[PDB]
């Protein structure tokens, strides 16, 4: 289905996660098999409109990180408590 | 944007109903009313005739791009188009059939083989015989040329000998 573009995480921890969301982005992770987990950051509103579709979970998507494209499937999502805005998402390699 | 496939269905039809038709009539009517919707549309089914309402914006691109002998100026503004595809002796009558069943003053133009025929010139063409009338008109034309001229001449010289 989709194709999206992201950066590697700049900074981690309790304040840095909210500072990323104040910068109109949110954190995510990519894992799978015996390969190491990769942490990333990406923009909210465009990815939220894709994530609202069944096709984001029922089939694979591609993601660009460090200028290279890799194929993934979505695993899990976290949201804010007052409105459904994406707090964090999980992917697996496909 | 009428060229989009969802709107293109009426765009592609003008090539058949305005240029490709055997006879056509064009009128300034913005809508047909219940009376013409009920009877005039249904009367056309037995005559080989059909009719539809068409948008100006479509025609500004369609009748200007399509080659027409003076007919395309009558497709400016709203248009009721009425047309026929077969049997010339019935098809050509559409201008008179419109003027009988509907308001004759709403007609902008009338056409044959997809080309304009002026309202002062189409009169005989819209009075044309059907196949079974035309073979009778041929026998009558052969009679008029052979005997008719002479019996008309005999009656005229008779009437000229009554006078003083």
């Amino acid at each position: 289905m989709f194709t999206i573009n992201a950066e590697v995480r700049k900074e981690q921890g309790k304040g840095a996660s909210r500072r990323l969301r104040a910068a109109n982005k949110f954190p995510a992770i990519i894992y799978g098999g015996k390969e190491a987990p990769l942490a990333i950051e990406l923009d909210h509103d465009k990815v939220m409109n894709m994530q609202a579709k069944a096709e984001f979970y029922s089939e694979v998507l591609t993601i660009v990180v460090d200028g290279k494209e890799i194929k993934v499937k979505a695993q899990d999502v976290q949201r804010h408590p007052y409105k459904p805005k994406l707090q964090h998402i999980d992917f697996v390699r496909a | 944007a009428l060229n989009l496939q969802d709107k293109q269905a009426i765009v592609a039809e003008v090539s058949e109903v305005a240029k490709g038709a055997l006879s056509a009539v064009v009128a300034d009517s913005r809508g047909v009313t219940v009376d013409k919707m009920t009877e005039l549309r249904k009367a056309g089914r037995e005559a080989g005739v059909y009719m539809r309402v068409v948008r100006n914006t479509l025609l500004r691109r369609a009748v200007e791009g399509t080659p027409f002998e003076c007919l395309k100026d009558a497709f400016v503004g709203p248009t009721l188009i009425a047309y026929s595809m077969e049997h010339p002796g019935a098809a050509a009558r559409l201008f008179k059939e419109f003027a009988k069943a509907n308001a004759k003053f709403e007609v902008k133009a009338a056409a044959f083989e997809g080309e304009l025929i002026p309202a002062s010139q189409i009169d005989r063409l819209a009075t044309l015989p059907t196949y079974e009338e035309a073979i009778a008109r041929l026998m009558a034309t052969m009679k008029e040329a052979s005997a008719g001229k002479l019996v008309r001449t005999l009656a005229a010289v008779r009437d000229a000998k009554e006078a003083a």
Binding site: - | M37, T38, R41, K42, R45
Partner: protein, 141 residues
């Protein structure tokens, strides 16, 4: 001038027009007696099945004279008569009644072919099937 109303709808049984509330909105407001209407209507509409309510349009003039013109009876009344049912289901689709054949449904379509805008008799036969759905009548080939 006509002064009074023209081409007002009514539905009425020929030679059986006794009750006055079901005609008052068309005839009684225009000073026309149901007996005076019926002695004209049952003589000019004698050929139909008298038990069926015929749809008519009526017109009344400034001198209290009047004129009327008929339609063919309702497609749901023709379907009721053809299926042999006492009534339609009154809760259609969810509940259904009777049966009618497609050969009889085409005769109802031919009965309405002089009174509908249609271009083909099979297409008008599907129009009568659309009425059969609304009365909850079963239709089968």
């Amino acid at each position: 001038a006509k002064k009074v109303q023209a081409y007002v709808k009514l539905q009425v049984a020929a030679g059986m027009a006794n009750p006055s509330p079901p005609v008052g909105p068309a005839l009684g407001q225009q000073g026309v007696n149901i007996m005076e209407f019926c002695k004209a209507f049952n003589a000019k509409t004698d050929s139909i099945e008298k038990g069926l309510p015929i749809p008519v349009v009526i017109t009344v003039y400034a001198d209290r004279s009047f004129t009327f013109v008929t339609k063919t009876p309702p497609a749901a009344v023709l379907l009721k008569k053809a299926a042999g049912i006492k009534s339609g289901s009154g809760k259609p689709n969810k509940d259904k009644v009777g049966k009618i054949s497609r050969a009889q449904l085409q005769e109802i379509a031919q009965t309405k072919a002089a009174d509908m805008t249609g271009a083909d008799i099979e297409a008008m036969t599907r129009s009568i099937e659309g009425t059969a759905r609304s009365m909850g009548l079963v239709v089968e080939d």
